[PDB]
Amino acid sequence: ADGVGNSSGNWHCDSQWLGDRVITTSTRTWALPTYNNHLYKQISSQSGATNDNHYFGYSTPWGYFDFNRFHCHFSPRDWQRLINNNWGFRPKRLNFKLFNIQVKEVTQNDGTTTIANNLTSTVQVFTDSEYQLPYVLGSAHQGCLPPFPADVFMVPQYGYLTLNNGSQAVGRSSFYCLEYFPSQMLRTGNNFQFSYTFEDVPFHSSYAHSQSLDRLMNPLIDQYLYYLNRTQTASGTQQSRLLFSQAGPTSMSLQAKNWLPGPCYRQQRLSKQANDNNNSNFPWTGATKYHLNGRDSLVNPGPAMASHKDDKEKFFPMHGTLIFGKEGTNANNADLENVMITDEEEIRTTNPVATEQYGTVSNNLQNSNAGPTTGTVNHQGALPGMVWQDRDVYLQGPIWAKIPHTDGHFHPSPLMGGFGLKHPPPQIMIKNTPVPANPPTNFSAAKFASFITQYSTGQVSVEIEWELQKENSKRWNPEIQYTSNYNKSVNVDFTVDTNGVYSEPRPIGTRYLTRNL
Amino acid sequence: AHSQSLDRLMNPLIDQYLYYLNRTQTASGTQQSRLLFSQAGPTSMSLQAKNWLPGPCYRQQRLSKQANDNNNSNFPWTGATKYHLNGRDSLVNPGPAMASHKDD
Amino acid sequence: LMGGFGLKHPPPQIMIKNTPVPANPPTNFSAAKFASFITQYSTGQVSVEIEWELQKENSKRWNPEIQYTSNYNKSVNVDFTVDTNGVYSEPRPIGTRYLTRNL
Numbered sequence: 266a267d268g269v270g271n272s273s274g275n276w277h278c279d280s281q282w283l284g285d286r287v288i289t290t291s292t293r294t295w296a297l298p299t300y301n302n303h304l305y306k307q308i309s310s311q312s313g314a315t316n317d318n319h320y321f322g323y324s325t326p327w328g329y330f331d332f333n334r335f336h337c338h339f340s341p342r343d344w345q346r347l348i349n350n351n352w353g354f355r356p357k358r359l360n361f362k363l364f365n366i367q368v369k370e371v372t373q374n375d376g377t378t379t380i381a382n383n384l385t386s387t388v389q390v391f392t393d394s395e396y397q398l399p400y401v402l403g404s405a406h407q408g409c410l411p412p413f414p415a416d417v418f419m420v421p422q423y424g425y426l427t428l429n430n431g432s433q434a435v436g437r438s439s440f441y442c443l444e445y446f447p448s449q450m451l452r453t454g455n456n457f458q459f460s461y462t463f464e465d466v467p468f469h470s471s472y473a474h475s476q477s478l479d480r481l482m483n484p485l486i487d488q489y490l491y492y493l494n495r496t497q498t499a500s501g502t503q504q505s506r507l508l509f510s511q512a513g514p515t516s517m518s519l520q521a522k523n524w525l526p527g528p529c530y531r532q533q534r535l536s537k538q539a540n541d542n543n544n545s546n547f548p549w550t551g552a553t554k555y556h557l558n559g560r561d562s563l564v565n566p567g568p569a570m571a572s573h574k575d576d577k578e579k580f581f582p583m584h585g586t587l588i589f590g591k592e593g594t595n596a597n598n599a600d601l602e603n604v605m606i607t608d609e610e611e612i613r614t615t616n617p618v619a620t621e622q623y624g625t626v627s628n629n630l631q632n633s634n635a636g637p638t639t640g641t642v643n644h645q646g647a648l649p650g651m652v653w654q655d656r657d658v659y660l661q662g663p664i665w666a667k668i669p670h671t672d673g674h675f676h677p678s679p680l681m682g683g684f685g686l687k688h689p690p691p692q693i694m695i696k697n698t699p700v701p702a703n704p705p706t707n708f709s710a711a712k713f714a715s716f717i718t719q720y721s722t723g724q725v726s727v728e729i730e731w732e733l734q735k736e737n738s739k740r741w742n743p744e745i746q747y748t749s750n751y752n753k754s755v756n757v758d759f760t761v762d763t764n765g766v767y768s769e770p771r772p773i774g775t776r777y778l779t780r781n782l
Numbered sequence: 783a784h785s786q787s788l789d790r791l792m793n794p795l796i797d798q799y800l801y802y803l804n805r806t807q808t809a810s811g812t813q814q815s816r817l818l819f820s821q822a823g824p825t826s827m828s829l830q831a832k833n834w835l836p837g838p839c840y841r842q843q844r845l846s847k848q849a850n851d852n853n854n855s856n857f858p859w860t861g862a863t864k865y866h867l868n869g870r871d872s873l874v875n876p877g878p879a880m881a882s883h884k885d886d
Numbered sequence: 887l888m889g890g891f892g893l894k895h896p897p898p899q900i901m902i903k904n905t906p907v908p909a910n911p912p913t914n915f916s917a918a919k920f921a922s923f924i925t926q927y928s929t930g931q932v933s934v935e936i937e938w939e940l941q942k943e944n945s946k947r948w949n950p951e952i953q954y955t956s957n958y959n960k961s962v963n964v965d966f967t968v969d970t971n972g973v974y975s976e977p978r979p980i981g982t983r984y985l986t987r988n989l
Contacts, residue, residue, distance in 0.1 A: 296908035296920060308794055317828035322794045334799075369924075371910045380910065380924060399786060401793035403833055405800050407917035417920040419911050424795040427785050430885045439785040535803070535817065544815045546807040549829075557836050559884040562789040565802060565831040587831070588801040588819060596797065598809065598818040604801050646838060661799075666833040669788065679833040681800075722908050796915060 267454035269384055274364025274456055277726055278414050280343045284735075286357065287347065289338040290728040293410050297388070297420040297721045300326045302714075303699045305442065308424065309432040317560045321429035327443050328420035330361075330693040332727045333402050333683075336412040336660045341759040341773070344660045348775045349746045353468030353734035356664070359690060359727065363390060363457040366723035368697065373718075382453075387698040388721045390457045391448035392691045396667075398441055399425035400692065403666030405681055410727070412661075413767035423694060443694055450698065461691065466684045468734050469658055472780040473611035475740070478524055478652065479517070481782060487513035490521045505633070526623070527616045527653025530568050531643040532582035534620035537601060541579075552584060567680060569656040570619035572609040581606055582619035587681065589661050592768035611776045612654040647675065652782075658682045660773045665689050697721050736778050745777050788834055789827070797823035800831045840878050904928050943985050952984050 267273050281288040303326045310319040332338065339347070347354060368386035372379045401423070408421025427438040449457055482488075488511055495508035512520040533551050536542050554561045565584045573580050587607045594603040609619070617623055623645040631637040655678045658664075666679035667689045677685040702715040738744075749758060756762055758770045792798075798821055805818035822830040843861050846852050864871045909922040945951075956965060963969055965977045 294906055294908070296911045298911040298913050300913065300915075314825075315828075318826055320790060320794055320824075320827055322790075324795055365905075367907065369910070378910070399791075401791070401796075404792040405798050405831055406793050406796040407799050408796055408915060409799075411919065417906050417908055419916060419920070421793075421915045421917075422795045424793055426787075426790040426792065426794050428787060429790075437783055437785060535806075537817075540815050542806060542815045542817070544807060544813060546805060548803045548806050551806075554828075555836055557787060557789055558881065560789065560828065562828050562832070563802070563830075564835070565829070568835075583803060588803075589799070590801050590819070590821075597820045598804055599801065599820070601817045601819070604819045663833075669791070669834060673837070680835070681831050681833055685833075718910075720908075720910050724905075797917075799917075 269453060271454060272365055273454060274362060274724060286733060287731045288728065289343065290726060291337055291410060291414065292724060292726045293414065294417045295420050295723060295725050296417060297328050297695055297697060299697050299720065300328065300422045303716060319429055319432050320426050321432060321434045321438065322424060322426035323440060324422065324424040325443055327423045327694045327696040329423045330420065330725060331402060331409040333664050334409045335658065335662055335664055337410040338729050339660065341660065344773060345747050348471055348777055350736060351733050352472045352736050352778060352780060353470060354731050355466050355468050356463045357730040357732050358462045359729040360460050361693060362726040364724050366451055366453055366721060368453065368719055368721045370717055370719040383719055384453060386700055386719060387450045387452055388695060389448045389450050389698055390695045391446050392459050392693050394691050398692060400667045401425060402689065402692065403663065403679065405663055412769065420695060464686060464688055469775065470654060471775045472778045473776045474614040474782050475779040476782045477614040478526060478782065479522060482517065482520060484514050487511050488520055492519050524652050525648055525650045527651050528568060528645050528647055529570055529617040529623045530564060531622065532585040532619040534580050535583045537579050537581065569612060569654060570609065570616050571613040572619060574618050585619040587662065589772050592766060605772045607659060607772045609656065616653050656680065656682045657774045657776050661769060744779060747773060747777055788836060789832060792827065792830060794824050797821050798830055802829050838878060839880055840874060951986060954980060954984055
């Protein structure tokens with residue numbers, strides 16, 4: 266509704282704080298290539314892949330837009346305003362736009378490449394509102410919008426997996442032609458828009474607890490409930506006798522309590538200091554993992570559990586945390602100093618430590634002849650009276666995941682983090698419409714393999730409205746805040762360098778402010 | 783029935799931005815303890831981070847439908863998975879919903 | 887201290903840049919940022935209109951006052967004008983203080 270010479274949109278990047286809510290908007294420039302020559306191709310694992318790694322699926326010519334990382338929507342300063350001042354947040358609604366679209370045709374002769382406007386060429390866009398396609402967003406892939414608004418990103422290619430037996434397929438395997446969906450077709454001067462409203466979801470926990478689960482008592486007062494203090498006589502000839510006391514300040518571990526820690530599935534502990542770890546290769550063998558249909562899948566990061574106990578910070582659970590990486594880090598076999606390993610430390614007060622046993626139970630019936638023996642609980646499922654915390658969310662990381670559609674689920678919170686949505690934000694699909702090269706002058710029923718090489722660029726705006734939960738605390742003393750360091754440095758954190766490269770020094774989490782259990 | 787396995791929900795084309803621990807030992811040379819991190823992707827799907835776990839299990843004993851591939855002994859009761867109430871062992875039948883067999 | 891008016895809210899900054907236009911992407915997805923751009927520049931027209939308020943001279947002095955004047959003597963180039971090569975020059979730093987007023 267514009268034409269060649271009128272812009273179809275404007276650049277809105279700002280954030281807006283109304284104090285009950287914050288509305289963050291991001292506009293970015295994208296570049297969409299032609300994927301796999303306008304073809305749907307089936308893909309599968311090769312021979313020699315282990316049983317665990319086999320897959321079967323389809324790659325599509327279509328691309329897709331992914332805003333599902335937080336730093337897309339928040340600047341490091343806007344993230345600080347949120348995490349320092351608030352006990353929780355959730356998304357409300359979003360608004361998406363594609364505008365200022367440009368389709369460029371590319372010709373190559375000799376070594377000289379030539380790029381030109383193709384004014385009549387079209388790009389196709391559809392959002393999947395009814396969740397009919399396989400939903401790949403919640404898998405924490407790349408291709409999401411950049412953190413930094415001046416970066417130009419490449420739109421990732423869409424592809425999906427279905428059932429496989431080995432590297433083959435079964436009869437239930439679904440094939441989806443995305444051409445089989447209604448999609449808006451846009452020339453330069455056409456724009457795309459849609460709106461989305463998040464379903465009701467719990468606020469995230471932007472707080473840490475000011476009390477441990479087992480410390481909820483009154484330190485001054487004794488209980489009126491007795492516990493068994495002694496199974497044997499105190500002094501004299503040792504003899505079996507049952508003696509009962511009332512627990513109190515001096516023994517807190519012995520008191521009766523109303524609640525249990527959350528469930529655990531135990532992790533292997535790793536030291537960050539070199540040579541304090543066993544010499545052997547055991548990321549896979551010593552791993553905690555689940556088993557489906559013959560395949561062992563690593564449990565990563567897994568159920569939310571504290572990363573380490575008190576003054577253990579040098580240790581982290583193996584596969585039990587999110588691990589980011591520094592700008593410029595190699596994608597294969599990077600050193601510990603290159604990656605940024607996150608920390609669950611705040612949830613010590615409720616969730617078990619990932620590397621420690623849940624507890625201990627008795628495995629026998631004792632008697633005068635048989636002494637009591639007790640077994641160790643490495644894994645525990647939900648018991649009545651458990652209370653736990655979800656894994657934290659970071660500036661870098663999943664905002665949401667799609668809850669799988671199944672008969673049942675238990676506490677459907679995504680294990681990488683974020684919000685579980687039955688109806689998440691839909692997938693936005695985009696491809697370049699094929700433009701044939703010159704046909705032969707005699708009819709041929711063969712399909713065209715000959716296409717004009719072209720790509721498209723444009724602008725993409727995303728606007729999310731977030732609801733805030735303000736901090737009500739009465740504590741007298743000050744609270745921990747997320748702060749920059751005042752000491753001088755060559756580079757400012759969360760900033761470009763001399764070469765124009767934007768980097769993030771650390772994985773900022775959302776839990777600073779405190780709250781009582 | 784589902785058209786996707788729970789651990790296959792990913793995009794087969796694209797790598798993750800999350801690192802995992804690829805190596806607890808040095809790749810080549812003198813073997814030495816070192817922690818090496820990669821990004822999971824198409825080639826290793828089993829190693830990627832995932833949002834969900836499979837349902838709960840209470841394990842069963844496996845039987846073959848072909849004659850003589852089963853142990854020779856009588857164990858419908860003894861080798862059974864069963865619960866316990868008030869002194870009585872009750873057989874767990876059919877029990878929590880679980881797949882009957884894996885592939886092939 | 888260089889001169890002019892001090893404004894708490896001066897005329898705002900007008901910022902402009904050319905939107906990046908990427909060159910052809912690779913045909914396989916890469917998460918690296920684009921370093922490859924179509925070289926381009928922009929030209930256009932810019933108008934500025936300021937309205938100025940004047941304070942007229944009320945003086946009662948009898949004798950004439952110093953004015954800023956051109957020199958009538960002949961010269962190769964006219965002041966505040968282009969030369970033969972088309973170059974515009976300003977011969978002198980004209981100031982604003984000529985008319986007189988009592989303390």
